Amino acid sequence: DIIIATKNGKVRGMNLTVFGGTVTAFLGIPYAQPPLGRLRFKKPQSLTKWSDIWNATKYANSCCQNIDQSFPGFHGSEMWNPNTDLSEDCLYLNVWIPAPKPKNATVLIWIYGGGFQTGTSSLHVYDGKFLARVERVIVVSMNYRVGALGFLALPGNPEAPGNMGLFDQQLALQWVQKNIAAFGGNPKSVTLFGESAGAASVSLHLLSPGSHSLFTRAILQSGSFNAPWAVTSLYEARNRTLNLAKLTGCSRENETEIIKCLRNKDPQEILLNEAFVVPYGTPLSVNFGPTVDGDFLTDMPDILLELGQFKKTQILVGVNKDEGTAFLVYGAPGFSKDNNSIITRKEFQEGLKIFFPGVSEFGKESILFHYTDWVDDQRPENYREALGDVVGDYNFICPALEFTKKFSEWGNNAFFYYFEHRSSKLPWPEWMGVMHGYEIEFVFGLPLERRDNYTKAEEILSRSIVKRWANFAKYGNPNETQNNSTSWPVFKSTEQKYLTLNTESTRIMTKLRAQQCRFWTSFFPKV
Amino acid sequence: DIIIATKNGKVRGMNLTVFGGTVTAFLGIPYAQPPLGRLRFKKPQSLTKWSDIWNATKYANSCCQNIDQSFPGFHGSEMWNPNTDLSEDCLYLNVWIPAPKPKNATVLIWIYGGGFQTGTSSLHVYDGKFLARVERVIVVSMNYRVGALGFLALPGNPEAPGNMGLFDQQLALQWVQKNIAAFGGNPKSVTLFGESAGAASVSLHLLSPGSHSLFTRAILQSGSFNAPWAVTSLYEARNRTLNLAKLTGCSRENETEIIKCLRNKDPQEILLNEAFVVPYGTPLSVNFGPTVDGDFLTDMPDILLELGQFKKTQILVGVNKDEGTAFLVYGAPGFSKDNNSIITRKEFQEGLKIFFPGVSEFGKESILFHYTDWVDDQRPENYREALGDVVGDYNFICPALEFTKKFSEWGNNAFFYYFEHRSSKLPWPEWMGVMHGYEIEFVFGLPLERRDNYTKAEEILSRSIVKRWANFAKYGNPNETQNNSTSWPVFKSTEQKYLTLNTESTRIMTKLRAQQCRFWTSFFPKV
Numbered sequence A, B: 001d002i003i004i005a006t007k008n009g010k011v012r013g014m015n016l017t018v019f020g021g022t023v024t025a026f027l028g029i030p031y032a033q034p035p036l037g038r039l040r041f042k043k044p045q046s047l048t049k050w051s052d053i054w055n056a057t058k059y060a061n062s063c064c065q066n067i068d069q070s071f072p073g074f075h076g077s078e079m080w081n082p083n084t085d086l087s088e089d090c091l092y093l094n095v096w097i098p099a100p101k102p103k104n105a106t107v108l109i110w111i112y113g114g115g116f117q118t119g120t121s122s123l124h125v126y127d128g129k130f131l132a133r134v135e136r137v138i139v140v141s142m143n144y145r146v147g148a149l150g151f152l153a154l155p156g157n158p159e160a161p162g163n164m165g166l167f168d169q170q171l172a173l174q175w176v177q178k179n180i181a182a183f184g185g186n187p188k189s190v191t192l193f194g195e196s197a198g199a200a201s202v203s204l205h206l207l208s209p210g211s212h213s214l215f216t217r218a219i220l221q222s223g224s225f226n227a228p229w230a231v232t233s234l235y236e237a238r239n240r241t242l243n244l245a246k247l248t249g250c251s252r253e254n255e256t257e258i259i260k261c262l263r264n265k266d267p268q269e270i271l272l273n274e275a276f277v278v279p280y281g282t283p284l285s286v287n288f289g290p291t292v293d294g295d296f297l298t299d300m301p302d303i304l305l306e307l308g309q310f311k312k313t314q315i316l317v318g319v320n321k322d323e324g325t326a327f328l329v330y331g332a333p334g335f336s337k338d339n340n341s342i343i344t345r346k347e348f349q350e351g352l353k354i355f356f357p358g359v360s361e362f363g364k365e366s367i368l369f370h371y372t373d374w375v376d377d378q379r380p381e382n383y384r385e386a387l388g389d390v391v392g393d394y395n396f397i398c399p400a401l402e403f404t405k406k407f408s409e410w411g412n413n414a415f416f417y418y419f420e421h422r423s424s425k426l427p428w429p430e431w432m433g434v435m436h437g438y439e440i441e442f443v444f445g446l447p448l449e450r451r452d453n454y455t456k457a458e459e460i461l462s463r464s465i466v467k468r469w470a471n472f473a474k475y476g477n478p479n480e481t482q483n484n485s486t487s488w489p490v491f492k493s494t495e496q497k498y499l500t501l502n503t504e505s506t507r508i509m510t511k512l513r514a515q516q517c518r519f520w521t522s523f524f525p526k527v
């Protein structure tokens, strides 16, 4: 029986067998008052004690969110859908502690991705237990609100200010600052790590003054705030709040009662009109994300990092290879999970309009041009791969590079990775390659588990990445220093060195897709 | 005393010492009635005998043309200005014969370049004597009308049909067909070769049915009809004839008397309003060139070669490296023959408007984009070199490639060269590099002459090129088969192999500037 006193009560945990060792987990500790009734759309309110024992013995409820049934019964998509009851009562977190309880352990905090419209800390791929077992860390993860009940914005209005999600994340960070010592954690060795919208969340934490003192280092997987999908400007933010109002019969004259109307609408007629608040969409449409609110983010994030007003510290950021491929089975003509998807050029041109609906007609022809440059017109596959690369480079790769590029030019240590192994177990077709999101099971160390159908090479790939990620957390260098493995250079402007990740050899390279990125970074911003 | 009977009289020549041998030259034989009085703007009329001896002992008059004094006293530009009296009486040609007089020699015919506005067969760099001496060929060269008295067009009107210049060239070809046997020539081994507008002339001979039976093979140096400057469409053709009419006080109602007015204007008030017939110009402005006339060219040349209605035969076509550089000292801001000409980007942007005056504003930004892609922003020279490459690739290189590319796809042997030696004697600044036009002295073999300040390496470069050019004429392969020198591949679509030309080694390469050319060839045609 293991039970530990927080600042607001005492909480009972569970003992887990992990690799012939044990790990303590406390699943579903509450950190913010349930954001219900009067309290939805507002910023999370801190707790009052219980006295009483909170049995942190089950994963709490996932926050309200839509669910992806494009493919019902297909593991490849349902593995990301929540595995808990949905409820606007969801501001809970989970900590995993090594056993015997450590004394001054580094803390790793996970923020899950989901285009800010979906997701939960409860997924099997986010199971922190292997990290605590193997590298004797404390893994923490929290649920933050999502979709419109996380990011609905009327700016300047505390009834619905925008960014209530990131604010949820940060009160979780606050809780770690005050409580983790109880658990044997060190509130001065705290490194965030997320993927996708989570990656974009942790990059936003770097710029938010409110979050400067609640962590030390940062890990960015497949996301950054400067990605085109990540921040919504105040004009669209309002154009989609006031929109959501029209399809829920809430359209009024006085902002301070649109909002009261919207909180008497039951949670779900909110969630299914969320998809329409925008005329044209893409598979990547973040209908309600971060905004510039003058609170969490005090103005346009691209400006403050270009001016360099951010936390100064080491960061670890990378991307996967075929990051664009996942999204083309959700719109693009000729694409299916159930064939090789050999598109013709005309289909490629209509693919581009879904992913760049407007955006001028020419803007598309120059995107087409820069990628159609066949090496050479032979190969039937090449339109197919071209449309994956455009979506991947535009939406993820080039931002990450251009993110870390300028984060280093202010003196900080940055390390960039490129993760090229496709899982032997990936349930998506081979043509999709090394998909967005399928770095994560390796980071969390699911293949270290030997009863699970990963290949032996993948267990050694995972053990390696787990150690680097580990060491970057404690000591700020992604070193694995003893089995003669590749040294990891610092990413600087000019040289721009990145380490690759796969089963075979781990190389050092420069210029991660420089030709492509500089189309997207230097010129497309004008069209 | 050497004197030989043509079909229209007998002509006396001269004996020249060339390299301790002798060569017979007959300079200034007339081949067409003087195109004067009633006869200007019309097609050249064939001769009636003289009986009488025509002493072909001096270079005849150059046809009327403007003269380039941008730089008076500068050898580099005046070496192209005529060296004979100007006169609309100018339809004369020159033949050089080996001694002892050959018996069935190959005939080489030279058509000089000049943007169709200038030029003459009398220049020292076109001195055919070394070719006849060294490789025992017969070199022939003719003067053809130029500027408006060569190419003024009102289409369908035999009083001024257009293309009277190429028609002059072709009656010269006719004369060779009927007379060259007298001189010891073989009217069935006849290969044309020109440079620049001359190159573009000989490519037009390939498409003209009237010229199919007057030659066998073709050499194309630094020009082809598909170049942007080479063919004028019937709308501008008329818009500049009727224009020329307004500035010479000839504007009338009845085409059949605009023309009679224009022939009572003395030759020179024609030539100096030639420059204004167009609102905006460039240094490359061909104010009166070839047109589609339905006689010499029976319709749009790009269509008939794309459909492949041309003479089927081997061709030899190439370009020089810094072909764009010569023209930027005639307009582009920041450029001078008397400094290193390090331009700034803004000057580069105004350079582009002179060379692409309109042409939309964006069209320019995408030209800028595709070339500004510094390797990297370091080097001060790079705007300067960029603007040379745009002019060279647009105007000469990419057309030649795209010309020969499709001439081969119909089964014919094509060989492509890339000439990279800059003359040790070039009077233009080093920054200009391997200039347009400065292949020719090597082809004619001026450095074979040893009293002349070329370097020893240039004499061996010239002897080599003279032999290839030679052998391509007789046997249709640009082979120099005995001193272990590089074999010359055939240029085909797909592989696209070209031989380079310089002092050091002669390499075989593929893909002559493929990235650039395919911007100009595939996409710019739309803007």
Ligand SMILES: COc1cc(CNC(=O)Cc2cn(CCCC[C@@H]3C[C@@H]4Cc5nc6cc(Cl)ccc6c(N)c5[C@H](C3)C4)nn2)ccc1O
Residues within 6 Å of the ligand: A066, A067, A068, A076, A077, A080, A113, A114, A115, A117, A118, A119, A196, A197, A229, A274, A275, A283, A284, A285, A286, A326, A327, A330, A436, A437
């Ligand atoms: C119409 O009802 C809705 C339904 C949904 C469900 N959403 C989707 O299917 C959107 C989607 C998500 N993905 C990723 C391929 C599968 C791996 C992961 C699945 C996850 C949902 C998601 N969305 C992202 C959006 C952006 Cl811009 C960037 C990354 C995303 C992402 N990583 C993920 C993941 C990983 C979780 N393809 N399409 C969202 C919003 C709705 O309004």
Ligand SMILES: COc1cc(CNC(=O)Cc2cn(CCCC[C@@H]3C[C@@H]4Cc5nc6cc(Cl)ccc6c(N)c5[C@H](C3)C4)nn2)ccc1O
Residues within 6 Å of the ligand: B066, B067, B068, B076, B077, B080, B113, B114, B115, B117, B118, B119, B196, B197, B229, B274, B275, B283, B284, B285, B286, B326, B327, B330, B436, B437
């Ligand atoms: C205003 O009076 C005029 C004066 C002129 C004199 N023209 C020029 O200076 C035009 C020019 C020509 N050149 C080439 C650099 C020197 C080497 C050669 C000089 C020759 C004139 C000429 N014009 C060409 C135009 C085109 Cl598109 C292509 C090639 C050309 C060319 N090879 C030459 C050469 C080579 C003979 N740079 N600018 C022409 C027309 C006029 O109306």
